[PDB]
Design a protein around this ligand. Sequence first.
Ligand SMILES: CN1CCCN(C)C(=O)COc2cc(ccc2OCC(=O)NC2CCCC2)Nc2ncnc3[nH]cc(c23)C1
Length: 351
Amino acid sequence: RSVEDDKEGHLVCRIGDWLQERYEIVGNLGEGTFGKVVECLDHARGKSQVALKIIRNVGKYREAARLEINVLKKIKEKDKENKFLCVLMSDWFNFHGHMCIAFELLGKNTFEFLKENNFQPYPLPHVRHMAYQLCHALRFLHENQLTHTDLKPENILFVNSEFETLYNEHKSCEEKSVKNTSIRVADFGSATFDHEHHTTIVATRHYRPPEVILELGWAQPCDVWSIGCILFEYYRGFTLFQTHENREHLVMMEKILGPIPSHMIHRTRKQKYFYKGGLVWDENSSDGRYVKENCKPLKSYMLQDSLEHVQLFDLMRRMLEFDPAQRITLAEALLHPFFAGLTPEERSFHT
Ligand SMILES: CN1CCCN(C)C(=O)COc2cc(ccc2OCC(=O)NC2CCCC2)Nc2ncnc3[nH]cc(c23)C1
């Protein structure tokens, strides 16, 4: 058996193949621009289930996965008992140029689940539990001088994504409801410690905070903004900022959240976004008309009036504060009355 790569550097993988004289491939899980995710049995560890992330054999991806491995090591040192809901590695190796990182086997990521539910949103109790877990996991990294920088639904995975199929009460359709809402945070390859180099731009655009857009520098509050975005997405089933471009995104922020504080406008070197101290944009352009038609004040997106919905929206708005210094921290978020709704099993992490 020659090892074969396709034209983009992906490993050609077959069921039955072994790697490191140990990992037997038994299924497919995923593929992205990074490589593939395959399900293996680990024959050195009693045929335990493994998700093996196999990185393209392309220098820059190999360099990034090396950075990811080094981060994952540091994270494990700080959480040896694996209590803080992070997806840590059990092993790593260079398989003929392909970096491979072995992880626990999980269910569907939270985007894929929403998508296979035809974008019907998670119910509030699931959203609440998921919020709590995310605040917990990330508070732990924040207190250990780490920022994730790339939180998004697809990097958050259910431990088990099995679901009940129910008839939607108020629509003429079926709905998939996850049976257990325990989640884990993955993909630490861009995670950055306080003392390490901070690139000008971080985050996937839809989850990217205004301080990064305005090139004001960033730290842990970046993750809080992303969390606010993710929670909106879970609750409504569509993205908060369905945007492709900076000026448009800022306009959306203004329409949904209110004016950008003038102290941030005064400090940014990105003055091309502003004119007479206000955002400058073409209301008659395609993006202009799109934003004017579609972006409404945040509170308008509430599905019900009841206390738990109001509390969710209070918390999201605090996570979506423009000023990163004023934005809610996750330690504070975990004291929010929204979380009074959690069952004792959810609150004590016995799910
Ligand atoms: C390695 N893994 C982070 C990888 C990087 N990352 C965050 C993603 O890629 C997100 O999207 C997926 C991740 C997994 C599987 C499928 C995904 O997408 C669907 C897709 O590709 N469909 C493909 C379409 C064609 C067929 C499959 N990941 C996991 N799945 C199961 N257990 C796991 N343990 C740890 C991980 C993991 C973390």
